[PDB]
């Protein structure tokens, strides 16, 4: 791709994602929406192989569903309240459209089933802007929504989603897929907390998008998409595994690390409202989570994989590759538990 | 993460499609006009909480200008009983519902 | 009487295109140096006559279609839409004298492509079907400056009403302001018909009309006659649109006769240039579009845009 | 910036017209004498009722019927 | 975890591209057959583009310079107004100069 | 010529929107009594239809405001013939 | 409600209920998401005329316009999916299952 | 209504005199005749979507004769010269990139 | 019966709908969807809105069921059960609503909905010397500038697109 | 000579100046000996349906003047 048009198509999909933000009309959400999907599309077609053009059709059907079902729930809100303002729902109707349609946009279960195939079928660079930067614009939609939210709905979308992302990855030796199921156990985890205090909603989301870029980061600059190849890591640079070490035991929330403070200020906000058994069952079932990212650690930083003959001749090159951001990236997602109460600023 | 960049700014980007009230082109009326000014001036700075309640009122006035189910409802339990006496030959029509009067202006 | 209204139009539409043939084979005839027909009728006036029931008791043709209903479809579009593009053309009154006749005919013409493509459907060659994705991505090329030009003209006129175009004209021509729009817009509506030079179906530059080729197509007669009334409609539609006459409203006849001879006189100007040049190649006329017309439009929408500003010259609404 | 031009004339005369169009199209309202009289008609044109006021007293600049002196005239549109 | 039923899954390729696992021929002849009618052309067309084109000849070939063989000069003169049925007197001037 | 005649043509739009707005007063009036009239003998014939049914209140507005509302189509043209119908809700909409 | 609003919905809901079942094509998908935006235009614009509500009668444009464009996507990603496969059917596009 | 029973006559003949072609040539009885994917082009797909895009472009630039009668001139006439100019753009964009080559 | 003719085209509508969902193939999927678009068209041209029926026409079925059908030219080769039994199944469900709500005069699938004709809830006023649906549709360009910015810059970056994945490069 | 064309544009023309004369002539005979009254706009139609009550006969046609006043 020309890195003109390149520049020009991420400042569309970050347009776009600020048109949602920004905007009080409904159209202009919708335009929102088409703006960001209709810029995403060559992102994920750069490589220009049949997995490439699978992966953007899945990505294209799902998201457009999505669109339409959000554009028939604005249209149901016309009726029922005859203005646009994007505020809470004067419908039941229109906020269960809407919900579907922001699930189909996060890719929360039961609508998750495009995630893993589309996270597969695209490069690093193209799923970390899936699974971290597409977050953004229906979490916000959903935090403006919230008064028409129904309960059960969120709520049952939330557990799927957090016990299907838990049984997901449990089988995935693809790291792509990995990240995929965790990014749908994580939406569930955000959604499940949005009716009861959606400042930890943001707080989830910020510390999410924090160690999914650390660990995307991490994954483009080993060149690894598989967890075999993940192995190979420490006959090659050996910090890397240190990283992935307290990446992954990090996104498991195992304190005393910073991933541990969404789903503890989760629990401890959903306990307020006098839910007890529904956070238990959310944190035994983030043991699967755990599970796997124990199994990736074991593969790649706590043992020695045995390695191949050619790694003797990438000894002697160091890496040429723009790794943006990544020690503030991995000190930011390790180290930030003693800075818990600063989630006020997103009050 | 509703930035609101628009009152920030000071800048109007959609405000004006928002509601029926707002500036029409060539100061054209909408059908709710005066019904959506009434439960929008009820309804403002007391919040969502205090609006479902305290002005629910003007809010069902708005929602039956807008879909007119009761006046349908209402018409239909006219237009029934009428054609039952009909039915029942206890009614004939006048001539200024059979179109035999000469309108008006 | 509605109905009386309606027959009047539509019985001599199918009279004109019967005899724009005889006028056609004519005015070739002479321009090439011979005559037209004139043994079959006196001076050729029943040759129509004899060419449409040779025509219409002709065999149907070789082979069997791929699908029916479209191949019945075809025809039946083609002369619906062929006869409803005359519907609001003020002459000087219109038949349904609507709003936005301008964007209904504009419309309706958009719709004519589907005989086009259902008719390659329709016929079992795939080089049939090639040859009309061609002709379908030259009518809607060709739409694309139909629609600009003819948008850049209604900016002098101030609605879409067909009507307000005669009171438009009233003191000058508008081919006067604006002749370039009306030379772009003469050989695109001469590109939208598929008429010579830009005629690839009927002619060469094509992959399947080659002498012993496959491809069972209707009767040649239907579409044919469609294809006339498009022909006469758009000069209709053109003359209405740039050469609008002075009209009477005490007598209407003055306006039926100005605008039937100068309808003439621009349908003459197709038979006259379809004998005076080659044809193009198909990418030829793609670029006469895509990198001569459209720019040139694109540039006069801008000019007829901020000229009535400037000019402090904007047409009313009504 | 002269043997360029003819150049691109002697080449490309059909783009060099359409700049050359859609550059006057673009700067000669900015330097045309006549684009606020466009702004002077279109707001002139009543497509709505002019609703009158209640005469409290003190509006001097409001005149009592169409035919007085005071108020918004158009002896411009009519003379230009 | 393979099963029973994810039994047929190979692992995927290690830079996710797969093999991607034909040009047009025309049988060409002339429009309307009155100026050429005889030619016969078989393409390989690439879309728009042309790239190989063999003409196949013979559909006129009458074997007149067989038949030359069994008649007299005289006899053989008018079988070449024949050969290019355009330029009749200049091969009958061509055969005039060879005998 | 365009720039003149579309000059005289805005002079011309101005002139007969005047007029209307000198007829409007008139037809404002005449509209109050028109639909005023219509919905008095809805009510008349309300009050002598539904009598039989239990607990009607004849004239009952079913907004809780006591504003005037505007009336709607069927509250005029409802107890009417269809031809009435058709020519107040499909007229213009089908004018030629 | 109006009588038409629910013979729209139902035509959303039949047009859905198409899209959220394949039979073989793509392009029978996209036919049904665009026979969904018909319906979306049509109930908007049904509305929008029937409340006299002025400033969104550009709405249904935009909606038509942004659609379309998404569409223009859509036979894209379908032309690369045939120029893959030699046809349009979604149970080639299953490489992403391993 | 005048413009339904225009339409509806305009069909019935269409109609009728494609049963007259389909069903007059079969009178004369003949005799009972008994002796006897393409290639894909992008070109083809990519000037049918830049006609759907700049179509789209034109339906944006549709509603420009009512727009001249707007009182804030100067805001019109800059959106509309943008949008004119968005259509010039992209038409540029399909030029240099060669997008608009062997249908030119 | 002429009353209720935007019932009728409604129910055409979704006739049509059933037609092509049921999916026979993507040339006859087309079909159906031209004849919906055109009826469902005529549902917008009898309320009033003259200008955005013709935008179905120029634009909808005029520009992107032509592309539609040009592409699915170049898809399907030219030359069943489940088709006709959902069609007859989605038109027996619509012909029983249909019955349900003109016995009725009242029904409730999802919303309760009235059994008059939809002509009862228009307005009784007139609009002058334009059009409200075209002065609005106008004012895309003097209030809608966000809105004209937003949209010329998604149908660039939409050219862009379809350059950039259509080279395959 | 090339005169030998005119008959055939004549009779064309001829059916080219059927439909307008036609369409003039009925909507002089269908509305009073006038133009048809042309309502693009809905004032048009109001005035138009106005006339149609005011005379009397169900015509918009029927023109009432100063006769119909006191
Ligand atoms: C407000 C929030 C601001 C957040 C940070 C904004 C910048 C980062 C985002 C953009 C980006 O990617 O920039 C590249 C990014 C470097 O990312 P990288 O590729 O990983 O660099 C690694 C090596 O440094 C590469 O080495 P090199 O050889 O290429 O060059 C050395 C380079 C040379 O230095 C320069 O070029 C700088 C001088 C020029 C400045 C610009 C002039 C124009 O030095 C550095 O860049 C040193 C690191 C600078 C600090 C990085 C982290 C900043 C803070 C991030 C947020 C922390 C939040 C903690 C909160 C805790 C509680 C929640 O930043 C810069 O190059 C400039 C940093 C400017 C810091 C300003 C801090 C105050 C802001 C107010
Ligand atoms: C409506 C009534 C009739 C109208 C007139 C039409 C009748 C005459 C018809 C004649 C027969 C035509 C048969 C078909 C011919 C098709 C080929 C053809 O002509 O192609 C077009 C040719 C195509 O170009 P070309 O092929 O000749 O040139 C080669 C082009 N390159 C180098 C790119 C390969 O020309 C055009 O596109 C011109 C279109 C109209 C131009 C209008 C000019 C306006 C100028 C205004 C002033 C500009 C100066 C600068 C600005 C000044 C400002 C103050
Ligand atoms: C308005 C636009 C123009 C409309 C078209 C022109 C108007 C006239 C249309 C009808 C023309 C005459 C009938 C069709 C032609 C029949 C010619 C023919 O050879 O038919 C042989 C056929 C069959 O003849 P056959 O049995 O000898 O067939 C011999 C041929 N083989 C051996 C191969 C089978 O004739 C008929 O079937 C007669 C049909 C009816 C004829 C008229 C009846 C009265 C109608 C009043
Ligand atoms: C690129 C953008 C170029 C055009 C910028 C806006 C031009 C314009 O007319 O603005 C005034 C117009 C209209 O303002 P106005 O001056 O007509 O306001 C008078 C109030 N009304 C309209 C109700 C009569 O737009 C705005 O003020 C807000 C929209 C544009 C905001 C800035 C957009 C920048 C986009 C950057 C990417
Ligand atoms: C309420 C919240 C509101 C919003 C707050 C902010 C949200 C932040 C969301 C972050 C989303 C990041 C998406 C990915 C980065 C964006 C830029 C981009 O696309 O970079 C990729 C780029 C492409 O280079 P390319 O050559 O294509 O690489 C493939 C190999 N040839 O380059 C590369 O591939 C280089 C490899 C390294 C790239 C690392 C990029 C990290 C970016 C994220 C930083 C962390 C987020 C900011 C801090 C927290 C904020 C909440
Ligand atoms: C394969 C299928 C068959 C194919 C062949 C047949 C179909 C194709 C050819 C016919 C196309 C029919 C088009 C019908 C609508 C045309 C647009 C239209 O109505 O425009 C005219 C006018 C709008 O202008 P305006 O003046 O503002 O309105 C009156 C206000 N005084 O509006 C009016 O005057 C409104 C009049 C009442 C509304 C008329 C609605 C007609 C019925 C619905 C459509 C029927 C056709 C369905 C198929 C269409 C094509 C797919
Ligand atoms: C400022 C107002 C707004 C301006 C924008 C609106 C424009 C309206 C018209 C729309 C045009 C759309 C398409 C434009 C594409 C331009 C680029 C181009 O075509 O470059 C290629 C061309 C050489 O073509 P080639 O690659 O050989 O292709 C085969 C063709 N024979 O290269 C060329 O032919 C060279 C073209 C560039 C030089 C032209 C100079 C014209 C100067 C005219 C006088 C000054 C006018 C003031 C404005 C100037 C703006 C540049
Ligand atoms: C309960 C949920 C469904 C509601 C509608 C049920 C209608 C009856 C059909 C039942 C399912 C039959 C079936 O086989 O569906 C699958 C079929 C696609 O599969 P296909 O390739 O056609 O055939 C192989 C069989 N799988 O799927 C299709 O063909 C689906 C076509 C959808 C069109 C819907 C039309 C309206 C249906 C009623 C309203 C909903
Ligand atoms: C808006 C206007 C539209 C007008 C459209 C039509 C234009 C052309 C009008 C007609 C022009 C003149 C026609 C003359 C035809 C030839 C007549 C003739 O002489 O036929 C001779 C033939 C055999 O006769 P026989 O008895 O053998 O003669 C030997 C005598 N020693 O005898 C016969 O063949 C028998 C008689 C045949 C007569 C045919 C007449 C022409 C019919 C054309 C159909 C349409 C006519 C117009 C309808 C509307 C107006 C009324």
């Known amino acids: 791709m020309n890195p003109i048009i390149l520049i020009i198509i991420l400042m569309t999909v970050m347009l776009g994602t600020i048109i949602v933000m920004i905007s009080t009309h409904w159209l202009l959400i919708w335009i929102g929406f088409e703006m960001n999907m209709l810029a995403i599309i060559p992102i994920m077609m750069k490589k220009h192989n049949p997995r490439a053009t699978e992966a953007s059709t899945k990505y294209f059907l799902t998201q457009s569903t999505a669109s339409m079902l959000l554009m028939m729930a604005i249209i149901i809100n016309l009726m029922f309240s005859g203005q646009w303002t994007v505020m809470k729902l004067f419908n039941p109707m229109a906020s269960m459209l809407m919900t579907m349609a922001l699930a189909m946009k996060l890719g929360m279960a039961p609508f998750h089933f495009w995630v893993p195939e589309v996270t597969q079928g695209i490069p690093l660079s193209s799923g970390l802007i899936l699974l971290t930067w597409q977050k953004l614009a229906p979490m916000s939609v959903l935090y403006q929504i919230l008064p028409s939210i129904n309960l059960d709905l969120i709520l049952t979308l939330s557990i799927l989603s957090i016990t299907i992302g838990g049984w997901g990855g449990l089988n995935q030796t693809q790291l792509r897929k990995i990240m995929a199921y965790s990014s749908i156990a994580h939406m569930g985890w955000m959604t499940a907390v949005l009716l009861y205090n959606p400042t930890m909603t943001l707080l989830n989301l910020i510390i999410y998008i924090i160690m999914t870029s650390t660990m995307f980061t991490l994954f483009m600059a080993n060149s690894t998409t598989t967890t075999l190849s993940l192995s190979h890591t420490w006959n090659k640079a050996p910090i890397m595994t240190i990283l992935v070490l307290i990446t992954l035991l990090s996104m498991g929330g195992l304190p005393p690390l910073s991933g541990f403070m969404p789903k503890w200020m989760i629990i401890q906000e959903m306990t307020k409202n006098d839910s007890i058994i529904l956070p238990t069952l959310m944190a035994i079932t983030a043991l699967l989570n755990l599970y796997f990212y124990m199994r990736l650690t074991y593969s790649t930083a706590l043992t020695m994989f045995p390695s191949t003959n050619n790694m003797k001749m990438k000894w002697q090159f160091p890496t040429t590759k723009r790794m943006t951001l990544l020690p503030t990236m991995t000190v930011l997602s390790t180290m930030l538990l003693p800075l818990t109460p600063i989630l006020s600023i997103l009050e | 993460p509703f930035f609101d960049v628009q009152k920030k700014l000071g800048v109007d980007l959609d405000h004006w499609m928002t509601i029926q009230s707002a500036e029409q082109p060539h100061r054209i009326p909408a059908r709710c006009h005066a019904f959506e000014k009434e439960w929008i001036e009820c309804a403002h700075g007391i919040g969502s909480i205090r609006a479902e309640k305290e002005c629910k009122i003007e809010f069902e006035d708005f929602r039956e200008c807008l879909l007119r189910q009761k006046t349908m409802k209402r018409l239909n339990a006219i237009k029934r009983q009428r054609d039952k006496l009909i039915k029942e030959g206890k009614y004939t029509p006048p001539p200024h519902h059979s179109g035999q009067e000469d309108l008006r202006p | 009487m509605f109905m009386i209204n309606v027959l009047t139009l539509i019985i001599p539409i199918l009279l004109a295109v019967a005899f724009l043939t005889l006028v056609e084979r004519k005015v070739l005839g002479y321009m090439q140096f011979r005559k037209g027909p004139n043994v079959v009728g006196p001076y050729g006036l029943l040759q129509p006559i004899a060419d449409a029931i040779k025509l219409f008791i002709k065999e149907p043709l070789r082979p069997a279609t791929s699908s029916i209903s479209m191949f019945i479809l075809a025809p039946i579009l083609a002369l619906t839409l062929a006869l409803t593009m005359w519907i609001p053309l003020p002459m000087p009154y219109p038949l349904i004298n609507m709003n936005l006749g301008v964007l209904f005919m504009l419309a309706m013409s958009s719709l004519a492509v589907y005989s086009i493509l259902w008719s390659g459907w329709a016929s079992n060659s795939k080089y049939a079907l090639i040859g009309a994705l061609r002709a379908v991505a030259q009518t809607i090329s060709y739409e694309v400056t139909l629609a600009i030009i003819l948008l850049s003209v209604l900016l002098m006129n101030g609605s879409f009403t067909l009507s307000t175009l005669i009171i438009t004209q009233e003191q000058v021509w508008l081919i006067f302001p604006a002749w370039p729009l009306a030379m772009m817009w003469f050989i695109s509506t001469l590109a939208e018909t598929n008429r010579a030079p830009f005629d690839l179906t009927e002619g060469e530059s094509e992959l399947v009309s080659g002498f012993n080729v496959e491809y069972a197509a209707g009767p040649f007669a239907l579409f044919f006659m469609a294809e006339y009334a498009n022909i006469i409609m758009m000069n209709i539609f053109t003359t209405t649109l740039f050469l609008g006459a002075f009209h009477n409203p005490y007598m209407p006849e003055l306006y039926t006769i100005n605008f039937t001879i100068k309808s003439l006189l621009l349908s003459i100007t197709f038979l006259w240039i379809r004998a005076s040049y080659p044809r193009f190649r198909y990418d030829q006329l793609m670029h006469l579009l895509w990198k001569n017309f459209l720019p040139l439009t694109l540039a006069l929408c801008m000019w007829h845009v901020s000229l009535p500003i400037l000019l402090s010259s904007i047409p009313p609404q009504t | 910036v002269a043997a360029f031009l003819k150049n691109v004339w002697a080449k490309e005369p059909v783009l060099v017209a359409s700049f050359a169009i859609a550059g006057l199209a673009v700067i000669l309202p900015t330097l045309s004498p006549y684009t606020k009289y466009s702004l002077m008609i279109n707001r002139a044109t009543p497509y709505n009722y002019p609703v009158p006021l209640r005469d409290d007293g003190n509006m001097p600049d409001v005149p009592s019927h169409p035919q007085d002196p005071q108020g918004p005239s158009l002896e411009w549109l009519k003379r230009l | 975890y393979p099963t029973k039923e994810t039994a047929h899954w190979k692992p995927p390729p290690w830079n996710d591209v797969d093999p991607p696992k034909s040009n047009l021929t025309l049988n060409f002849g002339p429009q309307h057959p009155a100026a050429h009618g005889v030619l016969r052309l078989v393409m390989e067309l690439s879309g728009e583009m042309v790239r190989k084109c063999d003409p196949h000849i013979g559909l006129l070939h009458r074997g007149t310079e067989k038949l030359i063989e069994y008649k007299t000069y005289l006899q053989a003169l008018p079988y070449f107004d024949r050969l290019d049925y355009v330029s009749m007197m200049c091969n009958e001037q061509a055969y005039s100069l060879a005998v | 010529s365009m720039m003149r005649w579309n000059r005289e043509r805005r002079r011309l739009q101005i002139e007969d929107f005047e007029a209307r707005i000198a007829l409007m007063p008139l037809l404002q009036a005449e509209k109050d009594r028109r639909v005023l009239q219509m919905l008095r003998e809805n009510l008349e014939e309300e009050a002598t239809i539904m009598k039989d049914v239990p607990g009607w209140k004849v004239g009952e507005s079913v907004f809780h405001t006591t504003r005037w509302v505007t009336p709607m189509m069927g509250e005029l043209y409802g107890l009417r013939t269809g031809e009435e119908i058709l020519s107040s809700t499909y007229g213009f909409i089908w004018y030629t | 409600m109006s009588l038409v609003y629910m013979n729209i919905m139902m035509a959303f809901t039949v047009s859905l209920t198409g899209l959220l079942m394949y039979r073989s094509h793509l392009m029978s998908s996209l036919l049904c998401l665009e026979g969904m935006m018909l319906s979306l235009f049509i109930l908007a614009t049904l509305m929008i005329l029937n409340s006299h509500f002025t400033l969104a009668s550009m709405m249904p444009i935009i909606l038509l316009v942004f659609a379309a464009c998404e569409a223009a996507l859509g036979l894209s990603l379908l032309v690369m999916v045939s120029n893959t496969y030699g046809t349009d059917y979604v149970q080639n596009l299953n490489l992403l299952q391993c | 209504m005048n413009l339904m029973i225009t339409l509806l006559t305009n069909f019935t003949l269409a109609t009728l005199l494609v049963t007259i072609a389909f069903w007059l040539p079969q009178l004369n009885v003949y005799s009972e005749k008994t002796s006897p994917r393409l290639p894909f082009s992008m070109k083809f797909f990519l000037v049918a979507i830049t006609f759907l895009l700049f179509d789209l472009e034109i339906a944006l630039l549709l509603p420009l004769p009512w727009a001249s009668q707007t009182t804030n001139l100067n805001t019109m006439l800059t959106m509309a010269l943008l949008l004119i100019f968005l259509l010039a753009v992209s038409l540029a964009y399909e030029w240099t990139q060669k997008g608009l080559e062997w249908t030119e | 019966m002429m009353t209720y003719i935007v019932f009728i085209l409604s129910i055409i509508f979704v006739m049509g709908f059933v037609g092509f969902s049921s999916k026979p193939s993507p040339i006859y999927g087309g079909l159906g969807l031209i004849v919906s678009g055109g009826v469902g068209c005529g549902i917008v041209l009898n309320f009033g809105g003259s200008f955005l029926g013709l935008m179905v026409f120029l634009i909808y079925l005029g520009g992107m069921m032509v592309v539609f059908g040009y592409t699915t030219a170049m898809a399907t080769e030219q030359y069943n059960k489940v088709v006709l039994g959902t069609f007859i199944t989605g038109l027996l469900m619509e012909f029983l609503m249909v019955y349900y709500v003109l016995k009725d005069k009242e029904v409730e699938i999802v919303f309760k909905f009235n059994g008059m004709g939809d002509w009862v809830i228009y307005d009784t006023g007139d609009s002058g010397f334009f059009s409200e649906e075209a002065m609005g549709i106008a004012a895309l360009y003097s209030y809608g500038t966000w809105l004209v910015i937003v949209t010329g810059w998604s149908l660039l970056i939409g050219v862009v697109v379809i350059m950039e994945i259509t080279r395959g490069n | ?70």
């Open chain 10, 1 to 70: 000579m090339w005169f030998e064309v005119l008959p055939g544009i004549a009779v064309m023309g001829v059916c080219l100046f059927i439909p307008g004369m036609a369409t003039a002539r009925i909507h002089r005979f269908s509305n009073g000996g006038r133009e048809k009254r042309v309502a693009h706009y809905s004032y048009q139609w109001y005035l138009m349906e106005r006339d149609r009550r005011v005379s009397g006969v169900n015509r918009y046609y029927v023109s009432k003047g100063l006769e119909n006043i006191d």
